[PDB]
Short mmCIF file of C-alpha atoms and ligand atoms in Angstrom, two decimals:
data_model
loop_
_atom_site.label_atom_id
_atom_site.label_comp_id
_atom_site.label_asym_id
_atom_site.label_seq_id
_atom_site.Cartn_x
_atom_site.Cartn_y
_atom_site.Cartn_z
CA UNK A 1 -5.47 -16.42 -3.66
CA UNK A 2 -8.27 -16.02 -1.65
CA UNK A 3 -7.81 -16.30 2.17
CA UNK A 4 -3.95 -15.72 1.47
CA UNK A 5 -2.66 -13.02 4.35
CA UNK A 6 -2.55 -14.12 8.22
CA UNK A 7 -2.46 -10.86 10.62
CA UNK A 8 -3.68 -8.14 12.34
CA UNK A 9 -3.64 -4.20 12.59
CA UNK A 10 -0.79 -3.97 16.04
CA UNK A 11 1.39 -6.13 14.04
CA UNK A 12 0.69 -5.96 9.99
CA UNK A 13 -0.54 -8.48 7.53
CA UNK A 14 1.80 -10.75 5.75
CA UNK A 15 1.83 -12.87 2.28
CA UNK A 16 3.65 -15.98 1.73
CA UNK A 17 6.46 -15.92 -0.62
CA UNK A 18 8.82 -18.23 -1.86
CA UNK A 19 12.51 -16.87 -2.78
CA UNK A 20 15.02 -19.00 -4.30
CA UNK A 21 16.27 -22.52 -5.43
CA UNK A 22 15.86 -24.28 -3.31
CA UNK A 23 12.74 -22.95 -2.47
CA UNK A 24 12.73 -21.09 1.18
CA UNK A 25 9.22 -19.93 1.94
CA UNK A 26 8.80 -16.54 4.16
CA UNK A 27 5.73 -14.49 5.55
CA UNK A 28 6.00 -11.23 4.41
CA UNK A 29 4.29 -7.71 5.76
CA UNK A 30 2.22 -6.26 3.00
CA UNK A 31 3.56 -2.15 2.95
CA UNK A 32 1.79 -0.16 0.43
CA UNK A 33 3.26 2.55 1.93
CA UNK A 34 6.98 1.60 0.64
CA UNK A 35 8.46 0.96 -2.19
CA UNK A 36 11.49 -2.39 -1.06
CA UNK A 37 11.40 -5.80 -0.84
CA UNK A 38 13.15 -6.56 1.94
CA UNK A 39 13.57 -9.54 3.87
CA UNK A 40 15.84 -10.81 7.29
CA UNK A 41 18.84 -12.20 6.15
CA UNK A 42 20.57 -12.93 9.37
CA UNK A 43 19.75 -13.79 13.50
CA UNK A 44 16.97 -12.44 15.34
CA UNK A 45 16.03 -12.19 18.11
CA UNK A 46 12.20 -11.57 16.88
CA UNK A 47 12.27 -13.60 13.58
CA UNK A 48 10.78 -16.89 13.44
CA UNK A 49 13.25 -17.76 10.37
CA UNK A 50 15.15 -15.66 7.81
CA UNK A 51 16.87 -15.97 3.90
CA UNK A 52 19.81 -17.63 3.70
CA UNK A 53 21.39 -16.40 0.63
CA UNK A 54 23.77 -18.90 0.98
CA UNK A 55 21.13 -22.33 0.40
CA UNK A 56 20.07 -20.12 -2.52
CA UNK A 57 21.46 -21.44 -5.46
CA UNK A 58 20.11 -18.56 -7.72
CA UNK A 59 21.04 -15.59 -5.76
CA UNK A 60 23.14 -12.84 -7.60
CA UNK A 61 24.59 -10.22 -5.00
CA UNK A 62 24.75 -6.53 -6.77
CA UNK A 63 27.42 -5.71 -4.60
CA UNK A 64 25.73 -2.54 -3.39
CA UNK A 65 24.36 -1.50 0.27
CA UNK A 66 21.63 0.16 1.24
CA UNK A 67 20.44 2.59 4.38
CA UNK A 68 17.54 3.04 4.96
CA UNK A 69 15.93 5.43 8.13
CA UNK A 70 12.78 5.91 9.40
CA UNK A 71 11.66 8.49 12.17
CA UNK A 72 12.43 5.83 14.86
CA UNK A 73 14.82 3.40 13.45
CA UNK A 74 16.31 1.52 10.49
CA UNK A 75 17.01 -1.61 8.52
CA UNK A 76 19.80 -1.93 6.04
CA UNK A 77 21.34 -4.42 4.08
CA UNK A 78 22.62 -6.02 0.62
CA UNK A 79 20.97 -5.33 -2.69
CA UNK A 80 20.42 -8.71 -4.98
CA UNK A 81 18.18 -10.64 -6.77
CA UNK A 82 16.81 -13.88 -7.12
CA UNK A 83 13.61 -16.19 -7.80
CA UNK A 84 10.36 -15.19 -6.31
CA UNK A 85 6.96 -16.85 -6.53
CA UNK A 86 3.75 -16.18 -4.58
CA UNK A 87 2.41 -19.76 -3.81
CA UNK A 88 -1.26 -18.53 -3.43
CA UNK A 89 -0.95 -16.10 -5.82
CA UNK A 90 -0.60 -16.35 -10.14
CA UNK A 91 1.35 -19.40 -11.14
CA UNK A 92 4.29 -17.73 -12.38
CA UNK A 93 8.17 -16.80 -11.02
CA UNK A 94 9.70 -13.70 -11.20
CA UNK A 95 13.79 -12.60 -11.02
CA UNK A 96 13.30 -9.43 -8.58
CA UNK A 97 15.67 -7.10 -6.71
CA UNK A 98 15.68 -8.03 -3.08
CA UNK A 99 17.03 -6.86 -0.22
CA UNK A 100 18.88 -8.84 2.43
CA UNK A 101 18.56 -6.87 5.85
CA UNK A 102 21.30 -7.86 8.26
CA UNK A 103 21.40 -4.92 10.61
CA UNK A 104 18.19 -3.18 12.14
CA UNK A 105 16.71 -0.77 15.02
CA UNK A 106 13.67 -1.25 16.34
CA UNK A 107 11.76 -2.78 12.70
CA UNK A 108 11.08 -6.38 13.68
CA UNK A 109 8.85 -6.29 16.60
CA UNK A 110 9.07 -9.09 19.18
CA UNK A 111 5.99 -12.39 18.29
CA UNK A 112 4.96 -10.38 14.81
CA UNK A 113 5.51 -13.51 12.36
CA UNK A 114 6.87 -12.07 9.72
CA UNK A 115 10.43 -12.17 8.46
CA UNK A 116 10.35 -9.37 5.77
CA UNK A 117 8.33 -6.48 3.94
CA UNK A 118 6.93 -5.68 0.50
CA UNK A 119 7.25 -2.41 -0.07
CA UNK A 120 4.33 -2.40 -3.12
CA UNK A 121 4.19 1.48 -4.01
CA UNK A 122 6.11 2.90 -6.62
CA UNK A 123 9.95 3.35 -7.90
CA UNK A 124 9.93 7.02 -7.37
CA UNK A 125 10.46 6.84 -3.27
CA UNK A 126 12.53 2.70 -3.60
CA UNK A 127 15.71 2.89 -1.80
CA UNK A 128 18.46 4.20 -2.71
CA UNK A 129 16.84 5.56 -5.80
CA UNK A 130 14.50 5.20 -8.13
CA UNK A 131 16.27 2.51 -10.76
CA UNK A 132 16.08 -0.21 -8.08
CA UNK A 133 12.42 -2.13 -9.63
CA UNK A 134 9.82 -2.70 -7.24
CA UNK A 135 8.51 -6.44 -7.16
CA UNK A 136 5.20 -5.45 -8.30
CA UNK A 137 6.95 -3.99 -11.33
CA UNK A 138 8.86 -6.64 -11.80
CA UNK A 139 5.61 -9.23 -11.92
CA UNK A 140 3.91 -7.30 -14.24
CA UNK A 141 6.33 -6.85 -16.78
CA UNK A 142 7.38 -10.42 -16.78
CA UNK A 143 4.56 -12.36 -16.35
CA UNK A 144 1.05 -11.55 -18.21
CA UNK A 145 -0.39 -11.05 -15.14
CA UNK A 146 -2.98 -7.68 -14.81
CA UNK A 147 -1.71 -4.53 -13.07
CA UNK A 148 -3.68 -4.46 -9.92
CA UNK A 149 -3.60 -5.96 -6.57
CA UNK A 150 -6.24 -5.58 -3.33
CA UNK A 151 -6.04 -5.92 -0.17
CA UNK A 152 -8.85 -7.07 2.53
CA UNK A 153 -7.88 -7.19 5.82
CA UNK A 154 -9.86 -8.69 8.38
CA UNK A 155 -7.08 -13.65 8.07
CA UNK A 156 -7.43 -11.77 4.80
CA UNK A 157 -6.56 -11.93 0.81
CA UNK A 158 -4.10 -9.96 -1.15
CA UNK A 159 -5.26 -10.93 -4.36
CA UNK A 160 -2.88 -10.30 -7.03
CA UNK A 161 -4.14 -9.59 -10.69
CA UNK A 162 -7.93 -9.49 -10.18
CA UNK A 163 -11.09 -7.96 -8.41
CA UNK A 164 -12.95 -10.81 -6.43
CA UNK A 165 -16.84 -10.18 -6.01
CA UNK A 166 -17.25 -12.62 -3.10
CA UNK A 167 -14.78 -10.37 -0.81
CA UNK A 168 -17.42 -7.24 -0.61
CA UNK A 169 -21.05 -6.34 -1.25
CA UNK A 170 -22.52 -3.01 -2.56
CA UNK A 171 -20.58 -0.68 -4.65
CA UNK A 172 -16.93 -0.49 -5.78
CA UNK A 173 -16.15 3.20 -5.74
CA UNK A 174 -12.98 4.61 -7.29
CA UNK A 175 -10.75 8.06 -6.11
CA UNK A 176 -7.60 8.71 -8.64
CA UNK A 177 -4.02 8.05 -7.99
CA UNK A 178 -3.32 11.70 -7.46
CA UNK A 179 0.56 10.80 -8.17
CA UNK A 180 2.62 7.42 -8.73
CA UNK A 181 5.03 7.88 -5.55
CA UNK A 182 2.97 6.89 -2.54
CA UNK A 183 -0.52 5.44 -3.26
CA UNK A 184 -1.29 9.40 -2.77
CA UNK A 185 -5.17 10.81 -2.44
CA UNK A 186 -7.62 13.46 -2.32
CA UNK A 187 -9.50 13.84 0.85
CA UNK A 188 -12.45 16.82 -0.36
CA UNK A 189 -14.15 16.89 3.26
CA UNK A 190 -14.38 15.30 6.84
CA UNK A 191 -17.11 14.97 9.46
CA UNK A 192 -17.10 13.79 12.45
CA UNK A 193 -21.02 12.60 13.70
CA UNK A 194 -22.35 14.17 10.77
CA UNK A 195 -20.83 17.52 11.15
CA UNK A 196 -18.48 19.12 9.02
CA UNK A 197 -14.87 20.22 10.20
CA UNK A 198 -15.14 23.02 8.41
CA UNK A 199 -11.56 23.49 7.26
CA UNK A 200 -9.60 24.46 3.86
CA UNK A 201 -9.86 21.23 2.18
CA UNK A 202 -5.88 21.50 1.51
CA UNK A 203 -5.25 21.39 5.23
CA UNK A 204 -6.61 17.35 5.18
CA UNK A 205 -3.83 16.98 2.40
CA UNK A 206 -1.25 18.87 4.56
CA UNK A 207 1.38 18.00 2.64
CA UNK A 208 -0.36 14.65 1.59
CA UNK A 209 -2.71 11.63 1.79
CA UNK A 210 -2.10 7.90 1.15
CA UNK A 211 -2.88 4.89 1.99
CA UNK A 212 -0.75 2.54 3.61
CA UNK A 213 -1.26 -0.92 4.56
CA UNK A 214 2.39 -0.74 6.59
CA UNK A 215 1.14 2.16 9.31
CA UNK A 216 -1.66 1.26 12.30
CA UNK A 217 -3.32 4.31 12.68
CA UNK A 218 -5.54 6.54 10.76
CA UNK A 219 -2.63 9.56 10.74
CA UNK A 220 -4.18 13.38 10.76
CA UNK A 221 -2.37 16.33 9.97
CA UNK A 222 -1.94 18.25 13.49
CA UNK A 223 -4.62 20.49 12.63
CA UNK A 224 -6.96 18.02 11.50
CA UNK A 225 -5.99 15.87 14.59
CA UNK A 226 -6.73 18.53 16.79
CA UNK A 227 -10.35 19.37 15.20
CA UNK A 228 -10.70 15.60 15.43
CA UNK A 229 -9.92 15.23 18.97
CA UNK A 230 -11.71 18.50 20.21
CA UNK A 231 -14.79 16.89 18.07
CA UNK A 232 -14.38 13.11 19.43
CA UNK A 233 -14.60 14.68 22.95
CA UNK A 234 -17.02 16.51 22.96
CA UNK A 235 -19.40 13.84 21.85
CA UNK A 236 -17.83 11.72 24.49
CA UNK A 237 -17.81 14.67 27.14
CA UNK A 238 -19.48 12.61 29.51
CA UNK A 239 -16.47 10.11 29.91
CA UNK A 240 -13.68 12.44 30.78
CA UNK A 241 -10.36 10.37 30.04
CA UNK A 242 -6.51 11.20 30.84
CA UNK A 243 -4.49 13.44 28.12
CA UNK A 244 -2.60 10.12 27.97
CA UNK A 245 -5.59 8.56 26.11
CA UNK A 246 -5.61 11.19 23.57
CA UNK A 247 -2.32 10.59 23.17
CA UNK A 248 -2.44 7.29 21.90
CA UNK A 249 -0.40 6.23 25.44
CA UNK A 250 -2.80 5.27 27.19
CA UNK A 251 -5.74 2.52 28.08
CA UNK A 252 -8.86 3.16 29.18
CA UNK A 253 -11.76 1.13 30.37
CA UNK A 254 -15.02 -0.37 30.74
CA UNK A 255 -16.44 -3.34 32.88
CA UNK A 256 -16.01 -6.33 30.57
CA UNK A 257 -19.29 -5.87 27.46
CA UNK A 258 -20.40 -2.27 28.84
CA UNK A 259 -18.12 0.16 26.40
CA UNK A 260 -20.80 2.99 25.46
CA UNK A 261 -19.83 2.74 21.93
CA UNK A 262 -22.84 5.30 21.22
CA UNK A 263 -20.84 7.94 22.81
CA UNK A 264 -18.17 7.62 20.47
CA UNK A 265 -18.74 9.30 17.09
CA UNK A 266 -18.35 7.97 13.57
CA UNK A 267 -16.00 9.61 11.22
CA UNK A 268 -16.31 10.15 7.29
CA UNK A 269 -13.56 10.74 5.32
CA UNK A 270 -15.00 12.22 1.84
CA UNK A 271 -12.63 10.87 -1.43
CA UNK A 272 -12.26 12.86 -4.33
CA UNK A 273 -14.02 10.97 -7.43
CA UNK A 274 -13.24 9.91 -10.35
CA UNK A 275 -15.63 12.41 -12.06
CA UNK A 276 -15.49 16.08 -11.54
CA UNK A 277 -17.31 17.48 -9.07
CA UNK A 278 -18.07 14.07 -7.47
CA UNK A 279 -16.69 12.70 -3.99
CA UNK A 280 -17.73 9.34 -2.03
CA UNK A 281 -17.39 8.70 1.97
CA UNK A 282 -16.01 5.95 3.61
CA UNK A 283 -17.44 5.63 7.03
CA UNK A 284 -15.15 4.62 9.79
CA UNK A 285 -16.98 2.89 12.87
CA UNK A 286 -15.40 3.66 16.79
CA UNK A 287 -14.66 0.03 16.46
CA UNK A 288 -11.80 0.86 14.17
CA UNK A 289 -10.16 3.67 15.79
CA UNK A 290 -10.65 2.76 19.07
CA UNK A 291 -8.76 -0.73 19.60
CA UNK A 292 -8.63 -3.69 22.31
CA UNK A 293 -5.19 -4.36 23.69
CA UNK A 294 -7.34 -5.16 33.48
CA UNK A 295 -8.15 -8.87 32.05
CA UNK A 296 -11.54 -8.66 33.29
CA UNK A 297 -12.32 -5.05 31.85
CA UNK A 298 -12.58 -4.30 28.05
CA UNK A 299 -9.77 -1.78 27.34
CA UNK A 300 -9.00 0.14 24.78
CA UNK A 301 -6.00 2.20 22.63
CA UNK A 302 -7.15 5.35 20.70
CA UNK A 303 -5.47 4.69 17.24
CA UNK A 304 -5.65 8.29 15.44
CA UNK A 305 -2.63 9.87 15.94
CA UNK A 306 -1.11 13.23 15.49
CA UNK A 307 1.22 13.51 11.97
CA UNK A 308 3.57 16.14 10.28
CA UNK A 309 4.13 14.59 6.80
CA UNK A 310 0.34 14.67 6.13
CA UNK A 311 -2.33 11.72 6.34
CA UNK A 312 -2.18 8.05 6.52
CA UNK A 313 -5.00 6.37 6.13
CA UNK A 314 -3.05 3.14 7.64
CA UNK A 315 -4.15 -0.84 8.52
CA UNK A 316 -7.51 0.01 11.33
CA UNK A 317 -8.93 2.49 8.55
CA UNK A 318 -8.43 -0.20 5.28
CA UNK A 319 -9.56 -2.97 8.05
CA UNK A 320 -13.49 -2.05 7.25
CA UNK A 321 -13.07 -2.14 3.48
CA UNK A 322 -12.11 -4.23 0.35
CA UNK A 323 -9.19 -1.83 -1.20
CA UNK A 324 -8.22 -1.95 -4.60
CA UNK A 325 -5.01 -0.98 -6.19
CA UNK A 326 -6.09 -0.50 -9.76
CA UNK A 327 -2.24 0.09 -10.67
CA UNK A 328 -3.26 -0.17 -14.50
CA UNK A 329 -6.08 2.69 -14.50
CA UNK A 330 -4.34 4.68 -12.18
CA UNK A 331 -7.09 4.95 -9.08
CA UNK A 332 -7.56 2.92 -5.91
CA UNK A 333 -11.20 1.41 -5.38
CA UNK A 334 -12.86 1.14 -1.55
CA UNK A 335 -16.37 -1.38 -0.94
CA UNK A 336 -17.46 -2.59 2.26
CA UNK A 337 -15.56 -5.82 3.20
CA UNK A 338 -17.84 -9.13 3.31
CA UNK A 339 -15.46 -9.94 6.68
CA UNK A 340 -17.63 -9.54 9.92
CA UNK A 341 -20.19 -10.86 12.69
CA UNK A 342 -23.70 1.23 12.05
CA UNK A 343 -21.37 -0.59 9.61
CA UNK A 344 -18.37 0.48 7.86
CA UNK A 345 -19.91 2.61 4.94
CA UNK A 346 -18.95 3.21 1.65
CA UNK A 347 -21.03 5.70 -0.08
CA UNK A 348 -22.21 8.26 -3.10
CA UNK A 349 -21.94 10.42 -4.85
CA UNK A 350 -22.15 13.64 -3.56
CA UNK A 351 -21.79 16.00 -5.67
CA UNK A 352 -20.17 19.56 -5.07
CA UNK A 353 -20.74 22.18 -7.55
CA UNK A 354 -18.18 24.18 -5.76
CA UNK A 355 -15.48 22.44 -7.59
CA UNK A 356 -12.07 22.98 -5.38
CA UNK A 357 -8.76 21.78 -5.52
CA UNK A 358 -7.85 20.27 -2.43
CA UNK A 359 -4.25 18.98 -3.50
CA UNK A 360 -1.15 20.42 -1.54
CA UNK A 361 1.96 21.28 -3.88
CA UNK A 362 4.24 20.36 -1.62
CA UNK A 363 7.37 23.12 -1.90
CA UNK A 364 10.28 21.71 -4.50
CA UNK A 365 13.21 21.53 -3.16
CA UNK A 366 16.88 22.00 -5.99
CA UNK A 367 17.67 18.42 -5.23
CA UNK A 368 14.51 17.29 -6.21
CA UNK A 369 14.80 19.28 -9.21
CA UNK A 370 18.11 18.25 -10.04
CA UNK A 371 17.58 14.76 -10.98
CA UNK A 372 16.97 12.96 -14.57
CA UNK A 373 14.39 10.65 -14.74
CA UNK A 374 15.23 9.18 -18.48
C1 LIG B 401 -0.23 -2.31 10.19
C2 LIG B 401 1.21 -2.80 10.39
C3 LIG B 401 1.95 -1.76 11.21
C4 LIG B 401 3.31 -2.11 11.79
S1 LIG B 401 4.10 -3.66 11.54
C5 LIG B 401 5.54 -3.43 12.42
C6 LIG B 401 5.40 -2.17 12.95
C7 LIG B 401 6.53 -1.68 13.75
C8 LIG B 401 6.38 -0.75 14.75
N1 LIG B 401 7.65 -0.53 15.17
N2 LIG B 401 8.57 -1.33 14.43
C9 LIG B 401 7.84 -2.06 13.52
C10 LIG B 401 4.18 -1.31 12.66
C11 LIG B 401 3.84 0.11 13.11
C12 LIG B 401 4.12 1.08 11.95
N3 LIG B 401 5.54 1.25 11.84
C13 LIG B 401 6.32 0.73 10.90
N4 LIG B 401 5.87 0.19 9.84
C14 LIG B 401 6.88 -0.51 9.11
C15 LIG B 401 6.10 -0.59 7.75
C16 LIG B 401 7.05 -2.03 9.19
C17 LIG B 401 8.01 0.30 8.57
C18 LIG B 401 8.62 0.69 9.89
C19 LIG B 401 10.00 0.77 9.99
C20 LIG B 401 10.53 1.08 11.26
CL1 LIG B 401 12.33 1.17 11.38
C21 LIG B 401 9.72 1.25 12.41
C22 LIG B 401 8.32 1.16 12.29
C23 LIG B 401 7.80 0.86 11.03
C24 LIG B 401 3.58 2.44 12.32
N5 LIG B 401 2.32 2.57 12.75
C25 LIG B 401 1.80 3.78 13.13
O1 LIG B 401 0.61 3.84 13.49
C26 LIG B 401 2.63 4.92 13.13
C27 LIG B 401 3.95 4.76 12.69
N6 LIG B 401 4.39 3.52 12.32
NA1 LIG B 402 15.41 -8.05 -12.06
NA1 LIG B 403 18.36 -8.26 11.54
ZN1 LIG B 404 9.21 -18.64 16.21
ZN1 LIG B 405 20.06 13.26 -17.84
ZN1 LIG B 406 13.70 8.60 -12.10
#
């Protein structure tokens, strides 16, 4: 399984997996943040190929559609199931729900090379509800195969059922699942070139964090983003760049190998641990959040953005790291990848004393109250 994903963070990171009888073999974007497998079931103008549910001799329709909206646009399609194995992955083949997209707005994205998504959080936010079984749930309770999954992005592995040693050096350290809906976190306390933001620790978890391989940019509730940017600037202050750049719309530039990276500050995003009163860092370089995209000039995209559904620690933050979905002991572990040529940091403990919760409750609505989950 090692050396199993082909990507990058503009465009996502995609698995290979084989649906059906006859076998029809598909790259698929790796979305932690998302709870569907979905895959394109009909012409493209972006895909490279799509299922065809009619060569697919063991494809049951469920005769049910599906909607499903994001922020700026859609896919929807037909809810079935059939065969799915993960060539590079545990030698086993699972029946899981799937769904066939054959309308979207603005999803696939022109030259991305993949076809399809897997949507690997949990059944609580799956579309249309919360009965339709994830794939990951699906291989786990059908195959013996261990409840855990990581991801290291450099090209890269999604290794399915294990921890391997040879994808990162130092420590493996551990913050809890805070709840099984989105791979949800803790963050305890940010600093940006060593100093503290100084904010209620609730405000970095305004009105949550999690980690998602399916979004580019390290997300930041608008406060936080705000206290980020005023921060970032200033320690850049000699460089003064269009609002554009800030913006994420927006290149700027050096002359090609003279970027003064030094001017740029590091940013540590402090994880709740597993033990009370404990946190660890993970150090994020200006390599990360500032990215290449004029051909004789080095540009670059600022890739924090502004968010109002809380933080997202998304694919140019987990690009530094070996992440681990520990599904089965309910906690996600981060180590410093073993991919590369200050280095992404991940460090501890440090302990507080001060021992605060930094969890939002995020207000609950009657509808959410209303359902059953038997
Ligand atoms: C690391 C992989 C990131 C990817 S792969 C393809 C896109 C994409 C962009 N537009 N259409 C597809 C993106 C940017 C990402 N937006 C998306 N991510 C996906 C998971 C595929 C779900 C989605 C549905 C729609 Cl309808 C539009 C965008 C996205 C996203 N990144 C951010 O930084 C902020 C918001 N969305
Ligand atoms: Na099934
Ligand atoms: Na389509
Ligand atoms: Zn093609
Ligand atoms: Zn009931
Ligand atoms: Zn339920």
């Amino acid at each position: 399984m090692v050396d199993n994903l082909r990507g990058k963070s503009g465009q996502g990171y995609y698995v290979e997996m084989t649906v059906g009888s006859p076998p029809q073999t598909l790259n698929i974007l790796v979305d932690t943040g998302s709870s569907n497998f979905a895959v394109g079931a009909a012409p493209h103008p972006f895909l490279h190929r799509y299922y065809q549910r009619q060569l697919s001799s063991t494809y049951r329709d469920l005769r049910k559609g599906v909607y499903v909206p994001y922020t700026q646009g859609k896919w929807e399609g037909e809810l079935g199931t059939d065969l799915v194995s993960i060539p590079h992955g545990p030698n086993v083949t699972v029946r899981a729900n799937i769904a066939a997209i054959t309308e979207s707005d603005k999803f696939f994205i022109n030259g991305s090379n993949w076809e399809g998504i897997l949507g690997l959080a949990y059944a609580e936010i799956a579309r249309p509800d919360d009965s339709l079984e994830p794939f990951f749930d699906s291989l786990v309770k059908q195959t013996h195969v261990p409840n855990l999954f990581s991801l290291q992005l450099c090209g890269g592995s999604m290794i399915i059922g294990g921890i391997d040693h040879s994808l990162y050096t130092g420590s493996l350290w551990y913050t809890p699942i805070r709840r099984e809906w989105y791979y949800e976190v803790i963050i305890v306390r940010v600093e940006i070139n060593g100093q503290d933001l100084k904010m209620d620790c609730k405000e970095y978890n305004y009105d949550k964090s999690i980690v998602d391989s399916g979004t580019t940019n390290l997300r930041l509730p608008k406060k936080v983003f705000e206290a980020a940017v005023k921060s970032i600037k200033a320690a850049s202050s000699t460089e003064k760049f269009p609002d554009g750049f800030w913006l994420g719309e927006q290149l700027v530039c050096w002359q090609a190998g003279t970027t003064p990276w030094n001017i740029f500050p590091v940013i540590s995003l402090y994880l709740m641990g597993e033990v009370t009163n404990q946190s660890f860092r993970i150090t994020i370089l200006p390599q990360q959040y500032l990215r290449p995209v004029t051909s004789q000039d080095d540009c670059y995209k600022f890739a924090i953005s502004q968010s109002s559904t809380g933080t997202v620690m998304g694919a140019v933050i987990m690009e530094g790291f070996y992440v681990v979905f520990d599904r089965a002991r309910k906690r996600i572990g981060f180590a410093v990848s073993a991919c590369h040529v200050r280095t992404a940091a991940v460090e501890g403990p440090f302990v507080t004393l001060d021992m605060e919760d930094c969890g939002y409750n995020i207000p609950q609505t009657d509808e959410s109250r209303s359902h059953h989950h038997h």
